[PDB]
């Protein structure tokens, strides 16, 4: 009975990321005065199926890897931490109701970089190793800023429970008292998933270029699942919906619409700006984002004390 719940959680994730590839192509194309795929299916609805069947019957590369264990294990960890990370999400009721769901998601965010590191190490090309090192550094820096922003927002919330965020946002959204934290959180989640304008491996090498068509597809599925879930996390954290305990479908429809709009905003940001340099995004974090994060952390530590606005523990 519970395995039915697990399957109905994990199979729509794969369907959603395939049609997210389709939606990305269509929305990106319509924003630059052309169309997306509309030939393969009716309005291109059969495009992800054709792409999947094409990618699963292509000849594997078989690179001359130094180690085969890390080469196998990097997609394993990537897909596992992409799919495990969806379970404490309160939509409006979570699959696993946990006391420290935010800390759980932050722990898997910190743990997800080993796929990049092992993919960079397993490839025999040292240029791929350099690219993997740069991607790892970017991910851990924005992990730091994600942790501080999450700490301040939860200090407004008062507990690490993810379902309590619906209760604390019943009157007004948290984007109204925490819009600088909202903006910086959105940019940090953009830079976490190697999303434009923070991707580097596409510009002048990639860490996962040596993988076959299948493992590259699995890395793509993991990355796009991370993108969708991060948008859902931003929706739950800052733009919470009205929840009726007798009609959960109202909350489901509302936050689904909001997270769809946020994912469309991700694709919209992808097609508007040039790429950052590596040192420029390091400058953006360590010299611009971090001082404001520390200042707003002090402000949100002191603000409930001076306003008699301390939230309950339970």
């Amino acid at each position: 009975m519970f395995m039915i719940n697990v399957l109905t959680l994990i199979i729509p994730i794969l369907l959603a990321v395939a049609f997210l590839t389709l939606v990305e192509r269509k929305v990106l194309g319509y924003m630059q005065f052309r169309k997306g795929p509309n030939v393969v299916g009716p309005y291109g609805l059969l495009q992800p199926i054709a792409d999947a069947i094409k990618l699963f019957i292509k000849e594997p590369l078989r690179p001359a890897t130094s180690s085969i264990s890390m080469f196998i294990l990097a997609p394993i960890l990537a897909l596992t931490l992409a799919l495990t990370m969806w379970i404490p999400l309160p939509m409006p009721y979570p699959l696993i109701n946990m006391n420290l769901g935010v800390l759980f998601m932050l722990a898997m965010s910190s743990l997800a970089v080993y796929s990049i590191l092992w993919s960079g190490w397993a490839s025999n090309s040292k240029y791929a190793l350099i690219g993997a090192l740069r991607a790892v550094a970017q991910t851990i820096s924005y992990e730091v800023t994600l942790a501080i922003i999450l700490l301040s927002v939860l200090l407004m919330n008062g507990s690490f429970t993810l379902s309590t965020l619906i209760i604390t946002q019943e009157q007004v959204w948290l984007i109204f008292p925490a819009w600088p934290l909202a903006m910086m959180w959105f940019i940090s989640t953009l830079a976490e998933t190697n999303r434009a304008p923070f991707d580097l491996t596409e510009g002048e090498s990639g860490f996962n270029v040596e993988y076959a068509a299948g493992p590259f597809a699995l890395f793509f599925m993991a990355e796009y699942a991370n993108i969708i879930m991060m948008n859902i996390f931003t929706t739950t954290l800052f733009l919470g919906a009205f929840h009726n305990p007798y009609m959960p479908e109202l909350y489901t429809i509302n936050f689904t619409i909001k997270s769809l709009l946020l994912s469309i905003t991700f694709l919209w940001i992808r097609a508007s700006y040039p790429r950052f340099r590596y040192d420029q995004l390091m400058h953006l974090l360590w010299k611009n984002f971090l001082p404001l994060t520390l200042a707003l952390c002090m402000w949100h530590v002191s603000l409930p004390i001076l306003l008699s606005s301390i939230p309950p523990q339970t």
């Binding site: 209760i167 019943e170 009157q171 008292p177 309950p312």
Partner: protein, 48 residues
């Protein structure tokens, strides 16, 4: 808005807590009788 809702949340929390501390003595007595019954059963089994 956040300060108003947080004060209301604190009031509801202390209402729930005072309900719990009103309910405490019956559960305490039930727990004492249950653990005494379990210890007595274990004592009889150890005896036999």
């Amino acid at each position: 808005s956040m300060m108003r809702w947080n004060r209301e949340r604190r009031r509801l929390q202390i209402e729930d807590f005072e309900a719990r501390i009103a309910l405490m003595p019956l559960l305490q007595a039930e727990k004492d009788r249950r653990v005494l019954q379990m210890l007595r059963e274990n004592l009889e089994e150890e005896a036999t």
